[PDB]
């Protein structure tokens, strides 16, 4: 394949699912779960960073750049992967957060549960609608890391773009495998990385209240603290840029 593929790469650099560490037995509790996802979130995040530095060209960007990129698209990446996991078999749409923390028919019936899962289901249901191959998923996964930037680019913009494209190219080769009007297939996928922007949005709107109100009783690991705290009134000043494909 003209030696190691940048694709067959991310595939091995792709992280390994974590366990919620949920108790189950004690009847389910809405926040008992949410608060259980969050703890888990921070780990995936952390695991994501390691996954990022592990990408070609990433370590190369100016650190402050690398530092904000993740800062933005952590949500976006957290949700895209999960969609995959649910899509992986959960025909009942079941939200699969961990190999031990899945959200079934009736777990979904819980208080203000479906009220937010509906968004996450969007993905998997969408991914399932486009039968995305693990290859394409990997490549898009990476491209979501670049879904949004400042408003004034980065100390390594030139680089950043340089890289980005190469993946937009790696994704092409990805779609290729399996021809004809491949160009439409490309379109559909491409319009879904843009969809994520709204997705990643509603999630923040729900995540910030819950992160704020202690009349909720939900807890976040420190990881997401620095990360949330920061990004909050921050991006809420239109100081960021949600990168698109189609306007």
């Amino acid at each position: 394949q003209l030696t190691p593929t940048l694709v067959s790469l991310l595939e091995v650099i792709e992280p390994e699912v974590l366990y919620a560490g949920y108790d189950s037995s004690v009847p389910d509790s809405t926040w008992r779960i949410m608060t259980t996802l969050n703890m888990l979130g921070g780990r995936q995040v952390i695991a994501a960073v390691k996954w990022a530095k592990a990408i070609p060209g990433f370590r190369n960007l100016h650190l402050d750049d690398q530092m904000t990129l993740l800062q933005y698209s952590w949500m976006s990446l957290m949700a895209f992967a999960l969609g995959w996991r649910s899509y992986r078999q959960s025909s009942a749409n079941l939200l699969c957060f961990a190999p031990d923390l899945i959200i079934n028919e009736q777990r979904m019936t819980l208080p203000d549960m479906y009220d937010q899962c509906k968004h996450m289901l969007y993905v998997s249901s969408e991914l399932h609608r486009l039968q995305v191959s693990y290859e394409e998923y990997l490549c898009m996964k990476t491209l979501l890391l670049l879904s949004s930037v400042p408003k004034d680019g980065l100390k390594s913009q030139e680089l950043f773009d340089e890289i980005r494209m190469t993946y937009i190219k790696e994704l092409g080769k990805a779609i290729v495998k399996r021809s004809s009007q491949n160009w439409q297939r490309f379109y559909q996928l491409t319009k879904l990385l843009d969809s994520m922007h709204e997705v990643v949005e509603n999630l923040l709107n729900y995540c910030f209240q819950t992160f704020l109100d202690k009349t909720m009783s939900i807890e976040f690991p420190e990881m997401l603290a620095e990360i949330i705290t920061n990004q909050i009134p921050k991006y809420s000043n239109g100081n960021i840029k949600k990168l698109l494909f189609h306007q």
Binding site: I46, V49, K50, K53, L63, M67, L70, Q71, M223, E226
Partner: peptide
């Protein structure tokens, strides 16, 4: 913060 130590460690 730690995000940076993790990033640059």
């Amino acid at each position: 913060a730690l995000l940076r130590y993790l990033l640059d460690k």
